[PDB]
Amino acid sequence: SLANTYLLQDHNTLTPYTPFTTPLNGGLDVVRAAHLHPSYELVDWKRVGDTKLVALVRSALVRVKFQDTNTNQNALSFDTQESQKALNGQDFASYVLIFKAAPRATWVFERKIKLALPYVKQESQGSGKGSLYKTLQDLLVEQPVTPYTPNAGLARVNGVAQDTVHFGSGQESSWNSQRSQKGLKNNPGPKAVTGFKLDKGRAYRKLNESWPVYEPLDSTKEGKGKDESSWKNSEKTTAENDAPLVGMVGSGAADTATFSKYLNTAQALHQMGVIVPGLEKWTDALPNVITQLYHTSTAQLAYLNGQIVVMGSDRVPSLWYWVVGEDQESGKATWWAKTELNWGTDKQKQFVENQLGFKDDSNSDSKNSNLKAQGLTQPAYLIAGLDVVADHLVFAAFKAGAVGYDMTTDSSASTYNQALAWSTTAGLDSDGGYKALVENTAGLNGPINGLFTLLDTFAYVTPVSGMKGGSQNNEEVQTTYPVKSDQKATAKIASLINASPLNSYGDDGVTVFDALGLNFNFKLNEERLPSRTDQLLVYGIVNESELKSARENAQSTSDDNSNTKVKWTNTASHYLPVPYYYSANFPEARNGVKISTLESQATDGFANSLLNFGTGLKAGVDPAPVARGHKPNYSAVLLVRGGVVRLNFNPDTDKLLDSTDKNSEPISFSYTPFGSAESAVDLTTLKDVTYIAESGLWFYTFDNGEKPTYDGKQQQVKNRKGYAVITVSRTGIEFNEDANTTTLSQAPAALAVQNGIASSQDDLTGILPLSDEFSAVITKDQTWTGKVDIYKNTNGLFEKDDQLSENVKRR
Numbered sequence: 001s002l003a004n005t006y007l008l009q010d011h012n013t014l015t016p017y018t019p020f021t022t023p024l025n026g027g028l029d030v031v032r033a034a035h036l037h038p039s040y041e042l043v044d045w046k047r048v049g050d051t052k053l054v055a056l057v058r059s060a061l062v063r064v065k066f067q068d069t070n071t072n073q074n075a076l077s078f079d080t081q082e083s084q085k086a087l088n089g090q091d092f093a094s095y096v097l098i099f100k101a102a103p104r105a106t107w108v109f110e111r112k113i114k115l116a117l118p119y120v121k122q123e124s125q126g127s128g129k130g131s132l133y134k135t136l137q138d139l140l141v142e143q144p145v146t147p148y149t150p151n152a153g154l155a156r157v158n159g160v161a162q163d164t165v166h167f168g169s170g171q172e173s174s175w176n177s178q179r180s181q182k183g184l185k186n187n188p189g190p191k192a193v194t195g196f197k198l199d200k201g202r203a204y205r206k207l208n209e210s211w212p213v214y215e216p217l218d219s220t221k222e223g224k225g226k227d228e229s230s231w232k233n234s235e236k237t238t239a240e241n242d243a244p245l246v247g248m249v250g251s252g253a254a255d256t257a258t259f260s261k262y263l264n265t266a267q268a269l270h271q272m273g274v275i276v277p278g279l280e281k282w283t284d285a286l287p288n289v290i291t292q293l294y295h296t297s298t299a300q301l302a303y304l305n306g307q308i309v310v311m312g313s314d315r316v317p318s319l320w321y322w323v324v325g326e327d328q329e330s331g332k333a334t335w336w337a338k339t340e341l342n343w344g345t346d347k348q349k350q351f352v353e354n355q356l357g358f359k360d361d362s363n364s365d366s367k368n369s370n371l372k373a374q375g376l377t378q379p380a381y382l383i384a385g386l387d388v389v390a391d392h393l394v395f396a397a398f399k400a401g402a403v404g405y406d407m408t409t410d411s412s413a414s415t416y417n418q419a420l421a422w423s424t425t426a427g428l429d430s431d432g433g434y435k436a437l438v439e440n441t442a443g444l445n446g447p448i449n450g451l452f453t454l455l456d457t458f459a460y461v462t463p464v465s466g467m468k469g470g471s472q473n474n475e476e477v478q479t480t481y482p483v484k485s486d487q488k489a490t491a492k493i494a495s496l497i498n499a500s501p502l503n504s505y506g507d508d509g510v511t512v513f514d515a516l517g518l519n520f521n522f523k524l525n526e527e528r529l530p531s532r533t534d535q536l537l538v539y540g541i542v543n544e545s546e547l548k549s550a551r552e553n554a555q556s557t558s559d560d561n562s563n564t565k566v567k568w569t570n571t572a573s574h575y576l577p578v579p580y581y582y583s584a585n586f587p588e589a590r591n592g593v594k595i596s597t598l599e600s601q602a603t604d605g606f607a608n609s610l611l612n613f614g615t616g617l618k619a620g621v622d623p624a625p626v627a628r629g630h631k632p633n634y635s636a637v638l639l640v641r642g643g644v645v646r647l648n649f650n651p652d653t654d655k656l657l658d659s660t661d662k663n664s665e666p667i668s669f670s671y672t673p674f675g676s677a678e679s680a681v682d683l684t685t686l687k688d689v690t691y692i693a694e695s696g697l698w699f700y701t702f703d704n705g706e707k708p709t710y711d712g713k714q715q716q717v718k719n720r721k722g723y724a725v726i727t728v729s730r731t732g733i734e735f736n737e738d739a740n741t742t743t744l745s746q747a748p749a750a751l752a753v754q755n756g757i758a759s760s761q762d763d764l765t766g767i768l769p770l771s772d773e774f775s776a777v778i779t780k781d782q783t784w785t786g787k788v789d790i791y792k793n794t795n796g797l798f799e800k801d802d803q804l805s806e807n808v809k810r811r
């Protein structure tokens with residue numbers, strides 16, 4: 001219509017635009033309308049129906065604190081003292097703002113909702129069963145992955161082999177003769193890696209420790225890992241001297257600088273939503289991990305009939321999400337370590353949980369604080385998005401790597417100073433079909449994969465798995481957690497989390513093969529063998545009752561219900577590796593390849609070709625003709641590294657669209673690799689996602705300005721000016737297209753294309769989809785803001801309309 005207005009953001013302002021391409025007023029400054037502090041930033045907003053507008057705001061002054069040596073007191077709190085200290089040179093919590101429509105365009109503020117810290121029960125032998133508190137006390141979170149992190153930066157030294165673990169050094173000879181009784185019966189991999197060393201490399205910090213701005217170029221050579229003591233005492237200076245910020249003897253405004261040991265990524269971190277004091281627009285250390293965790297956690301929202309869901313960023317792992325009511329004043333976050341998801345099958349759930357840490361009935365140690373031991377599920381996610389459709393919430397995220405680590409004081413120990421993680425790729429001998437493949441026992445309870453020299457060829461997966469061991473081939477192929485039998489009651493395994501969807505950073509081929517999807521069986525109609533811990537995509541459909549249950553849980557003050565979990569049944573997991581061709585080694589349009597030797601040819605806005613990232617989840621109802629009295633079809637689409645994924649749902653059941661067949665690949669998931677041109681689009685710069693109800697199309701708008709100011713080698717970023725638009729469109733046979741279209745053999749897919757709306761010249765304001773044929777690109781750069789350029793769609797391909805753009809341009 002003409003009456004319809006398109007809203008567009010610019011920092012904290014939301015300006016209404018008409019189809020004449022002109023704005024109705026100077027917009028709504030969400031912060032100043034809410035009577036909020038000037039250090040506030042608007043992070044997400046949604047125009048609920050015709051008269052409501054919900055928004056999300058956060059502050060870089062927020063300061064969080066965790067206590068580790070009274071009654072119903074929470075161990076997690078806001079530190080208003082530090083929040084005040086930052087101001088020079090209340091709690092500044094995040095808020096959900098509700099607005100009501102008024103005369104002309106304009107909005108009127110209606111209320112504010114505080115997103116309070118999640119609850120955790122504090123213990124004290126000087127004041128007054130699974131403990132999330134113990135976990136947190138020894139929880140080591142990785143320093144965030146930047147777009148400037150090279151492949152060798154991820155490359156951590158491999159851990160010890162499992163034959164050394166169970167037999168000791170010098171007694172490995174007796175593997176085959178004693179595997180049967182040591183719980184490794186028919187296990188063919190004695191040389192299987194237990195994990196990776198935490199002695200050096202990229203930073204791993206405790207909940208009250210801080211991540212540094214500097215990062216290793218190669219974690220086999222430099223970095224200090226979890227060793228905060230050594231960094232602070234000697235390596236801090238080395239790092240500072242190697243990678244100082246722009247202005248060496250000229251920073252004061254409030255063997256010298258080689259960049260061969262570290263990369264200074266202060267600029268990249270800032271944009272990721274990480275608080276970097278000094279780089280504030282609205283040397284000194286960064287705020288503690290728990291603070292950045294709260295700040296980066298309040299990034300995305302949705303609205304479902306008086307209920308606001310708030311999830312975290314797609315760039316930093318999130319441990320908690322809010323389910324606040326429109327009526328409430330505040331509201332605590334719900335722990336992900338307490339939100340149990342259906343991973344498709346019990347075995348798929350097991351794979352993940354089993355790697356969370358060490359649990360045995362002989363062990364009752366407090367120092368053994370890992371999530372598995374505290375009976376807690378998967379803690380962290382890299383949330384791609386959430387969207388509301390047909391009175392249901394849909395979401396997608398990449399499961400972040402959450403492993404166990406050895407806390408032992410004993411420096412002569414096998415698993416001393418290392419993280420415990422192993423490959424979970426299905427055996428070469430796996431039975432055929434999807435169900436058969438995901439439920440394969442290879443690496444379920446412990447390591448099994450490594451280099452196997454099958455004839456005149458190599459294989460990084462086990463050639464014997466499941467119920468195929470022994471001479472007769474009917475025996476069990478066994479697997480066990482890397483902790484020696486006699487060392488079980490004494491074991492001190494804490495919990496560790498990576499800022500990526502991988503479990504092991506072990507500098508080997510097996511990891512590279514798991515992350516790139518290169519493990520395949522030797523069948524005629526060759527099937528790819530999947531991982532059940534590395535590069536996993538979690539997605540699903542939740543209802544109001546599941547969300548209420550997630551809210552009630554968060555408001556609980558631990559008590560007797562302290563070990564009660566949230567069960568989201570209509571979710572699923574899917575192995576989503578990065579394209580192998582993104583690396584220069586294996587493009588398909590020496591002594592083996594390890595993480596550190598893996599050269600990248602990725603153009604998608606990352607210095608690596610090892611880690612997967614997911615962004616812009618958007619639902620959308622198919623405008624196609626409806627079947628014989630059936631509900632209209634709807635799907636969700638998202639952009640991952642290398643292609644578009646489409647999540648399909650049964651409208652009738654309001655559940656994930658299933659086929660009732662175990663062998664066939666799931667019809668609720670589809671992945672289509674996109675072309676060379678769309679692989680050239682920087683995915684970290686996604687400004688907006690938009691679905692056109694009438695054309696059944698998704699429009700992903702990317703803005704170059706969202707790129708950092710300087711790279712790791714402290715040089716100004718190129719192509720900062722410009723924008724690019726991608727169109728996603730439905731493809732294939734649709735659920736109930738005709739009468740006999742009962743159950744579909746294939747899954748309905750999507751197609752990502754750079755439709756032609758692109759520039760590398762001006763600063764984008766936004767794109768107003770005028771009609772199915774014409775769209776205007778509104779650009780600033782010039783004095784006043786508003787250049788306007790009309791683009792016409794020709795068979796799905798945009799071309800600038802010289803005539804029309806020249807027309808609208810005269811004031």
Ligand SMILES: CC(=O)N[C@H]1[C@H]([C@H](O)[C@H](O)CO)O[C@@](OC[C@H]2O[C@@H](O[C@H]3[C@H](O)[C@@H](O)[C@H](O)O[C@@H]3CO)[C@H](O)[C@@H](O)[C@H]2O)(C(=O)O)C[C@@H]1O
Nearest residue numbers: 172173187188189190191192193448449450451452453454
């Ligand atoms: C993950 C893993 O452990 N992979 C190893 C692999 C497998 O153990 C088997 O293929 C299946 O069980 O074997 C690899 O090497 C095969 C050769 O092993 C040689 O034995 C060595 C070896 O170091 C030890 O097994 C032994 O204690 O000492 C021997 C040297 O003195 C054999 O002599 C040879 O015939 C092969 O069988 C493989 O790459 O396939 C090694 C993997 O680490």
